[PDB]
Scaffold this active site. Structure first.
Site, short mmCIF file in Angstrom:
data_model
loop_
_atom_site.label_atom_id
_atom_site.label_comp_id
_atom_site.label_asym_id
_atom_site.label_seq_id
_atom_site.Cartn_x
_atom_site.Cartn_y
_atom_site.Cartn_z
CD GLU A 49 -3.10 -0.76 0.31
OE1 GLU A 49 -2.95 0.52 -0.69
OE2 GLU A 49 -3.54 -2.42 -0.66
N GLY A 76 2.54 -12.16 1.41
CA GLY A 76 1.68 -13.14 1.21
C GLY A 76 0.34 -13.17 0.96
N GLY A 77 -0.28 -14.11 1.69
CA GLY A 77 -1.96 -13.72 1.69
C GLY A 77 -2.63 -14.37 0.26
CG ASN A 79 -6.36 -10.76 -2.57
OD1 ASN A 79 -6.91 -10.11 -2.81
ND2 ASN A 79 -7.53 -11.53 -3.30
CD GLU A 119 -3.49 -17.80 2.07
OE1 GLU A 119 -4.38 -17.04 1.55
OE2 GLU A 119 -3.03 -16.95 3.27
CB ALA A 190 -8.05 -23.58 12.47
CD1 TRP A 331 -9.64 -12.74 8.65
CD2 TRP A 331 -6.70 -12.45 8.50
NE1 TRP A 331 -8.74 -11.86 7.27
CE2 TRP A 331 -7.81 -11.74 6.77
CE3 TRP A 331 -5.46 -12.68 8.43
CZ2 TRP A 331 -6.52 -11.18 6.16
CZ3 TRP A 331 -4.87 -11.71 8.25
CH2 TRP A 331 -5.49 -11.17 6.39
#
Length: 359
Positions: A49, A76-77, A79, A119, A190, A331
């Site tokens: 960002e 990461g993430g 997207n 991911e 989880a 999260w």
């Protein structure tokens, strides 16, 4: 017990009372704060960002108010994809380029560690060789951090990883017993056990089964059995729900036919998901508890949402303690009723519960 909480740098763009900035953080709420997400450019850790560098300072500056607080930068993430990770771990040179950029980046902006959120290795387009290359990445980082701590005299940077609960993902890219040795802690995702990608309604994060491995318990037993020391397994908790549009308002049960994702929330604006504060905001809806799975769901007309409330969070904390796990992860900070404006349960209803129950 650890209370790992994720902050997202795009929540700052949500409208009105939903906007979330570093100032909206309760510095004493969690023991660890993870900044999501950082990116990658030419194999080097980088911001995602435009104002991250300022947010980093406000984020980590909170440690001046709470010296015990620890912060980490997550890379990461979803997207973000896997292509950049794959190319980076492809050679020893690229990994070294990355590791060096990570340490400088973390030290420069005052982060206490790095949280790996690839991911996922071995999935989402990532080839099979990435399973072992991920293990090497973890060892390279661990060796580098350990070395930098020895040569600098500084406390060693922490290294954690956010990992999937699904057996298929876990087997496709994680040499659990090996990476678990080099990681300070493991953030088990989880949740996302069920979602609108299924033609049947199902809960986002059920504790137990009512296919039988799609629950928190099965995921926990899997990571422990594969070699994860209990004290390093941090059980993730979702402050958001998974929504569906029903094939018929006439069948609202768990497992009822679904036509797709539920209507996007007014503030999160993403079909298939809803923040906790958007759910406790549903008017004229009916709430039900799934006895078996110990979690609740709510519906109205053709809309169905499986989420987590104070009760399920308390139940999952009792569960993690009984399993002797290292703590809980959540999260995300901005998805809980952080300003206590929507649920009339005070600020951070869900996360405060985790803190209270953990202590």
């Amino acid at each position: 017990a650890k209370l790992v909480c994720y902050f997202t740098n795009w929540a700052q763009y949500r409208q009105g009372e939903a906007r979330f900035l570093p100032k909206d953080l309760d510095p004493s709420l969690c023991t660890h704060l993870i900044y999501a997400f950082a990116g990658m450019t030419n194999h080097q850790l980088s911001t995602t960002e435009w104002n991250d560098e300022t947010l980093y300072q406000e984020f980590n500056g909170l440690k001046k108010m709470n010296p015990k607080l620890k912060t980490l930068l997550a890379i990461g993430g979803w997207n973000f994809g896997t292509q950049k990770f794959t190319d980076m771990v492809a050679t020893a040179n690229n990994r070294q380029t990355f590791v060096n950029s990570a340490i400088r980046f973390l030290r420069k902006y005052s982060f206490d560690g790095l949280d790996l959120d690839w991911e996922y290795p071995g999935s989402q387009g990532s080839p099979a060789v990435d399973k072992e290359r991920f293990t090497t990445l973890v060892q390279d980082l661990a060796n580098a951090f350990q070395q930098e701590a020895q040569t600098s005299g500084k406390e060693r940077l922490l290294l954690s990883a956010a990992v999937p609960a699904g057996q298929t993902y876990v087997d496709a890219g994680y040499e659990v017993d090996k990476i678990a040795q080099n990681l300070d802690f493991v953030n088990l995702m989880a949740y996302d056990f069920h979602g609108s990608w299924e033609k049947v309604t199902g809960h986002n994060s059920p504790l137990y089964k009512r296919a039988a491995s799609l629950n928190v318990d099965a995921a926990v037993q899997q990571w422990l059995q594969k070699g994860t020391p209990a004290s390093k397994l941090i059980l993730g908790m979702p402050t958001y729900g998974r929504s569906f549009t029903l094939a018929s308002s006439s069948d609202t049960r768990v497992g009822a036919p679904a036509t797709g994702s539920g209507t996007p929330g007014p503030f999160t604006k993403e079909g298939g998901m809803l923040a906790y504060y958007e759910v406790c905001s549903w008017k004229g809806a009916t709430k039900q508890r799934i006895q078996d799975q110990k979690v609740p769901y709510i519906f109205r007309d053709n809309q169905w949402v499986g989420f987590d409330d104070v009760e399920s969070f308390k139940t999952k904390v009792s569960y993690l303690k009984q399993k002797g796990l290292g703590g809980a992860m959540v999260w995300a900070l901005d998805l809980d009723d952080f300003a206590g404006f929507s649920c009339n349960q005070g600020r951070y209803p869900l996360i405060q519960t985790l803190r209270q129950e953990l202590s």
